[PDB]
Amino acid sequence: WDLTAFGLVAEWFLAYILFTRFFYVLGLAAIMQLFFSYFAVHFISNSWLM
Amino acid sequence: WLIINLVQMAPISAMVRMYIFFASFYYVWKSYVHVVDGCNSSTCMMCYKRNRATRVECTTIVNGVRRSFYVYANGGKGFCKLHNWNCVNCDTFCAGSTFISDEVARDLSLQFKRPINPTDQSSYIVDSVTVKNGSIHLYFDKAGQKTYE
Amino acid sequence: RNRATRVECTTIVNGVRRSFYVYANGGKGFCKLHNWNCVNCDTFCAGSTFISDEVARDLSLQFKRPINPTDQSSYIVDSVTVKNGSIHLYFDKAGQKTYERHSLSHFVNLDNLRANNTKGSLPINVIVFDGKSKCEESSAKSASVYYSQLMCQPILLLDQALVSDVG
Amino acid sequence: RNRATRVECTTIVNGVRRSFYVYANGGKGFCKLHNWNCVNCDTFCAGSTFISDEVARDLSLQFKRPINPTDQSSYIVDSVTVKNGSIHLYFDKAGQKTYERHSLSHFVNLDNLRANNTKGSLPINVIVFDGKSKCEESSAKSASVYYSQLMCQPILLLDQALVSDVG
């Protein structure tokens, strides 16, 4: 058996329990990573800085 | 030129899907907020509030002692528009039935912060008596019409 | 931090400043709906927390934090119907048409109920004023918040002309 | 050092601010039960310390040390019984059902005892109010604390209906 997902869920739950002002910036990073991983490709062209 | 570049960034389908993603996440967040913290419209009682239970406790003053009694309800199934209350078979008298009078209706309306309609008066006065076959008959007038038991 | 049961505040009626208390829970719960320490804030019984709109902003200005009000100070009646010795008062509530019933015995003498009486207390939840006189309406509006804070539940305003002909 | 016999404090009743004193001993004892310089705080004799719940929180803010209250401001009666010219008043006390007795001679006239009388003083430990009006109950609740400090021992609240009926 495997239970990595349950461990990650528990970590996120404990993080939500210990709420601070800086949880929102971490949530923003996570959602941005998910969004970029999901579609990508479409709006990336030129602009090596981007 | 900046506007022209922005509008021609992606095809329409990708824009629709990206809008759908954000809209779904926003609605999920709003639902999560609505679950925990409670809604503004507490009058409808939604589902996060009680007072949907079968029994309701009230008190009344008699002679020199304060007494308590229960008031029954349907538990959530159905609603009566005429009485504005969760009444069960209020047109018949039996064990477990509901009966609301003006002496308790006002207190219940104050407790629930909404109006309710009482169903019948508390008492009536007998005017004549007839005895037949070892039984006694009582007569009284209700709403201008003759009634007997 | 604070275990206080009552909170003081002031209001102006008839050109003078009166005072009244606002009850609080005293240390249990938080009531995130309106972020105030309330005791059973769903019943109009005596001793329950009642934050009116007119004083909600003053309280949220004395205490430097936002505070959400619970009920409006007063509402205006629109129609009245008598039935078997009872009187129904109809008024709007957040866009829904509702009503309220009371005994007819309280309406025998309007003078002890109208505006700022000599006794300083109201026997019932309704008030009567003349609709033509601007000053009477203004005084009733001013006293509505004070009389809705002295005792719980909002105050219903009745026009004298409307109820004059039913009696 | 500071053997201050009396401490000033204020309360709100009928829209005006009255004043009353709280007694203290001074340099004898500490009464660690409620950390105050009390004088025989276990007896209801005149001049004894009677720090009440409604004033404990207020006094804890003029000073900057915690203060423990001694007795609640008032209680609500439940039932009464007359016998041999005496009347017994039953009320709850911290979960225990107790009773208190008084003479029936004081109940001959209620108008000189109810709420804020013209004299401004109460002849007996009980108060009578009309329970059908929220304003009367609120006024009685607000004014109970001031008389609970003018004279020691808690104040008992009586509903008009029961005593009037048994009268």
UniProtKB/Swiss-Prot annotation, chain A:
Activity regulation info: Inhibited in vitro by GRL-0617.
Residues shown, of full length: 2316 to 2365 of 7096
Compartment(s) of residence: Host endoplasmic reticulum membrane
Bilayer topology term: Multi-pass membrane protein
Oligomer and partners: May form homohexamers. Interacts with N protein.
Job description of the protein: Responsible for the cleavages located at the N-terminus of the replicase polyprotein. Participates together with nsp4 in the assembly of virally-induced cytoplasmic double-membrane vesicles necessary for viral replication. Antagonizes innate immune induction of type I interferon by blocking the phosphorylation, dimerization and subsequent nuclear translocation of host IRF3. Also prevents host NF-kappa-B signaling. In addition, PL-PRO possesses a deubiquitinating/deISGylating activity and processes both 'Lys-48'- and 'Lys-63'-linked polyubiquitin chains from cellular substrates.
Reactions accelerated catalytically: Thiol-dependent hydrolysis of ester, thioester, amide, peptide and isopeptide bonds formed by the C-terminal Gly of ubiquitin (a 76-residue protein attached to proteins as an intracellular targeting signal)
Superkingdom of the organism of origin: Viruses
Protein known as: Papain-like protease nsp3
Stretches that traverse the bilayer: 3-23
